[PDB]
């Protein structure tokens, strides 16, 4: 509790590849962990401009910033200063697949995020490789303990510029690097938006708001 201050900064590094296009992203961010709110600024340092929709990347840049009821153990906050690790698979309806592995630690007072990501089997004419997405709709992640870790499931929806939508099934596993109290099953409501971006999305600012509730 005393190690996660009410205002926290973080740095993030991502190495990735989508349908063969390789890239690196460096970012800084900040937020109020106990309010469940955060913002980040991200810069494509290698491989820019990206030939794919930024949206598939935005959910990969921070579950330390989730507002939790007092009766729900904040497992991921408790994992610090050691931190936690998480791995994710997003299976999109058109066959596209994104895999992510991530490490979160605490160093010199800030959170350090190391991310690796791979996207594959995205149709060439699909909305991802053609940049036809308008960001994510608000999501509810079903969290539950299992295998000694905290798992999360979500059915997520990307807005399509034609007024339609692009569906994805997301499963994530978060595990503290030290023994900490796991919660019971609950839900986390998440809103993620791109708040600013330059013309070619080589600099992008994001906002996320996350809140835990009972079910």
């Amino acid at each position, epitope marked *: 509790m005393a190690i996660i201050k009410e205002f926290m900064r973080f740095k993030v590094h991502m190495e990735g590849s989508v349908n063969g296009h390789e890239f690196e992203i460096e970012g800084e961010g900040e937020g109020r962990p106990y309010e469940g709110t955060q913002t980040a600024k991200l810069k494509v340092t290698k491989g820019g401009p990206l030939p794919f929709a930024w949206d598939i990347l935005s959910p990969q840049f921070s579950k330390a910033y989730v507002k939790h009821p007092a009766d729900i153990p904040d497992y991921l906050k408790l994992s610090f200063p050691e931190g936690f690790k998480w791995e994710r698979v997003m299976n999109f309806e058109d066959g596209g697949v994104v895999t992510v592995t991530q490490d979160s630690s605490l160093q010199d007072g800030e959170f350090i995020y190391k991310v690796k990501l791979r996207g594959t089997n995205f149709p060439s004419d699909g909305p991802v490789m053609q940049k036809k997405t308008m960001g994510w709709e608000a999501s509810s992640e079903r969290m539950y303990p299992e295998d*000694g870790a905290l798992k999360g499931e979500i059915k997520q929806r990307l807005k399509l510029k034609d007024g339609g939508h692009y569906d994805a099934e997301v499963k994530t*596993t978060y595990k503290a690097k030290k023994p900490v109290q796991l919660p019971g099953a609950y839900n986390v409501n998440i809103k993620l938006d791109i708040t600013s971006h330059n013309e070619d999305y080589t600099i992008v600012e994001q906002y996320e708001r996350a809140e835990g509730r009972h079910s």
Partner: nanobody
Amino acid sequence: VQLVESGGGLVQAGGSLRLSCATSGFTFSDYAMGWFRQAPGKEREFVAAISWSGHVTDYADSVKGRFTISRDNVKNTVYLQMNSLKPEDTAVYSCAAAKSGTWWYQRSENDFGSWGQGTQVTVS
């Protein structure tokens, strides 16, 4: 430190097997695991690998679509479901734990350690 493969056997092509590997001596759920196979006279080759969470899997091209790697992080066991078996799948199959606790699509034999004794798979 201790990996024991089981489930091998002899079947005709088109059949199925399910290899398992029981683990002991380390926090299984923190390590990626890999299946390799070694044919007579040849060197070990990569078959499949699975990250610590089980969400990220990787397969050699020659088995993709036919084989499925999985894991049970409660029982601490690795599995390789083998369907549509072909004669060229005949080999000794061995399981290994990744040396580094940060696997990411690493297929090299040198990226894995603590090898079990293996189990024989023969396909006619």
